[PDB]
Coordinates of C-alpha atoms and ligand atoms in Angstrom, one line a residue:
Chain A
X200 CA 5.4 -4.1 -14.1
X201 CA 6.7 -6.0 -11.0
X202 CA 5.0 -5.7 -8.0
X203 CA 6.4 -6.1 -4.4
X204 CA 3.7 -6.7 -1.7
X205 CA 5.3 -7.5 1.7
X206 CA 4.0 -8.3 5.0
X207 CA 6.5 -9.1 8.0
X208 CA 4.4 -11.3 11.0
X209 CA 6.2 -12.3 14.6
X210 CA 4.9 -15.9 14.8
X211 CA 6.2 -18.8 17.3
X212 CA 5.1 -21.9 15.7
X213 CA 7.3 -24.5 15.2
X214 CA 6.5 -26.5 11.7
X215 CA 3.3 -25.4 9.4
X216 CA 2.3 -22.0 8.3
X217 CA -0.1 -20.2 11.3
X218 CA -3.5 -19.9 11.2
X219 CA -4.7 -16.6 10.8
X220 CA -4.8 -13.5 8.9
X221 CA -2.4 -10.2 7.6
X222 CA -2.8 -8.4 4.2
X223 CA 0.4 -7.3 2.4
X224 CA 1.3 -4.4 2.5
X225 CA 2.9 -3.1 -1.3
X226 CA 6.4 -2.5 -1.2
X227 CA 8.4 -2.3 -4.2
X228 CA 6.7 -1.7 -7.8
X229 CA 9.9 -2.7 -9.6
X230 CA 10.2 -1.4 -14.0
X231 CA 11.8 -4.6 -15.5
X232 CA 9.8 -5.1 -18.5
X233 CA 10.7 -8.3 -19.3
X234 CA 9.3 -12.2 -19.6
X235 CA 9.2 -14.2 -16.8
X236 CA 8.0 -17.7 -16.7
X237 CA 10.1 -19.7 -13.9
X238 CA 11.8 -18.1 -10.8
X239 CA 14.3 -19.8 -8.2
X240 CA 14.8 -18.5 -4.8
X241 CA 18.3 -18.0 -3.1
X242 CA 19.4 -20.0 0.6
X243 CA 22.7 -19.5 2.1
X244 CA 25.2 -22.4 3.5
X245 CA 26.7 -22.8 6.5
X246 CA 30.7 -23.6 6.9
X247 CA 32.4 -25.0 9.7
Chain B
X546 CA -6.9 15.9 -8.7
X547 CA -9.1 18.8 -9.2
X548 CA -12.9 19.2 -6.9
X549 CA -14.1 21.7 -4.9
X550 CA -14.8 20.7 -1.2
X551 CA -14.1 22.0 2.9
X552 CA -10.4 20.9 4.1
X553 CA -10.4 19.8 7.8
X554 CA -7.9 17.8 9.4
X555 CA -8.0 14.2 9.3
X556 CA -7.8 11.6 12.0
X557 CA -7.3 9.2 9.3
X558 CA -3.6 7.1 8.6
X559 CA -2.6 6.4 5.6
X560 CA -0.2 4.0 4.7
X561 CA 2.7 5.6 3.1
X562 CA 1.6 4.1 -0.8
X563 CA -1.7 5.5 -0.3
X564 CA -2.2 8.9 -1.6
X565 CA -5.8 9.6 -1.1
X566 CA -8.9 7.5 0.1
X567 CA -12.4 7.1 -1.9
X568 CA -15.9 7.0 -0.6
X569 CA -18.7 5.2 -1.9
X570 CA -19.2 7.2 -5.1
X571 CA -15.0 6.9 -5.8
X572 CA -15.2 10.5 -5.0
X573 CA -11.9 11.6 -3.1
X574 CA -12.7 12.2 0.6
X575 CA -9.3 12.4 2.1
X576 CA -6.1 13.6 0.9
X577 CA -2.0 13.6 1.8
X578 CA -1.1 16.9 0.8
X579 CA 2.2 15.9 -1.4
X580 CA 4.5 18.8 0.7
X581 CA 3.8 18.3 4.0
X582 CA 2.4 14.6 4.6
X583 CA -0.5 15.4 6.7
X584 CA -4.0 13.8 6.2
X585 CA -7.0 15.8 5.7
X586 CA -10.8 14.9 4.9
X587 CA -12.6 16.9 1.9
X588 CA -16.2 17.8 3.0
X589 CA -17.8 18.9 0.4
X590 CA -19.8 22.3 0.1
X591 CA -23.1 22.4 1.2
X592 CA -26.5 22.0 -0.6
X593 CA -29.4 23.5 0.0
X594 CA -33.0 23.4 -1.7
X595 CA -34.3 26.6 -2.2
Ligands
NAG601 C1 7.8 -15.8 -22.6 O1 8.7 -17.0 -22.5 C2 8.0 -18.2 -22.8 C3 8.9 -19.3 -22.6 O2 10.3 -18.9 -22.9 C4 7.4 -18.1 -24.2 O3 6.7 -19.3 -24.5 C5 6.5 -16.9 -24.4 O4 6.1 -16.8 -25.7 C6 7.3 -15.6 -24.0 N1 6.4 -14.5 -24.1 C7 6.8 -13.3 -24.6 C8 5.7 -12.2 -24.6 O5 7.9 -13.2 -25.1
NAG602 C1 9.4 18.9 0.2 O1 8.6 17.7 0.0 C2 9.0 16.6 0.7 C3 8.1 15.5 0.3 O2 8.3 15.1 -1.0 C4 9.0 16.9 2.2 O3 9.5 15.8 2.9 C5 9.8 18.1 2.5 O4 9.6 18.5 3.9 C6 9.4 19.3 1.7 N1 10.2 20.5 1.9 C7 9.7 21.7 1.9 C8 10.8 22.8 2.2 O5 8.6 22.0 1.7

């Protein structure tokens, strides 16, 4: 069972994570059923 | 989820995963009814020593 717990937080600091505190919220409780053991997130380019 | 209890109207919010809420003895004391989403709070009967 894959579970989604999400949290969105308007912040204006420039660099580090904030100080302070915001429980998540569950989002998605996602039926894969399979075995995970490493994960790799997705950024997106710029072109000019 | 079966009990016996007095439906009022709830000032409570749930969050929209949360179906009912628990009190101390796990006992549900509020309830989203599943057709209309409304909240309300389960007060149970009363009881009396006779
Ligand atoms: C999950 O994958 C890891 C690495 O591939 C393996 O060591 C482990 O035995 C696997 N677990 C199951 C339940 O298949
Ligand atoms: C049926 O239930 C849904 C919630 O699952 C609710 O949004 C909708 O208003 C209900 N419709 C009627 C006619 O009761």
């Amino acid at each position: 069972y894959f579970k989604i717990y999400s949290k969105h937080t308007p912040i204006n600091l420039v660099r580090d994570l904030p100080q302070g505190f915001s429980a998540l919220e569950p989002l998605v409780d996602l039926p894969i059923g399979i075995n995970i053991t490493r994960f790799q997130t997705l950024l997106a380019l710029h072109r000019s | 989820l079966t009990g016996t209890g007095v439906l009022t109207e709830s000032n409570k919010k749930f969050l929209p995963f949360q179906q009912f809420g628990r009190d101390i003895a796990d006992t549900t004391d509020a309830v989203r009814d599943p057709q209309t989403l409304e909240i309300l709070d389960i007060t149970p009967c009363s009881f009396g020593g006779v």
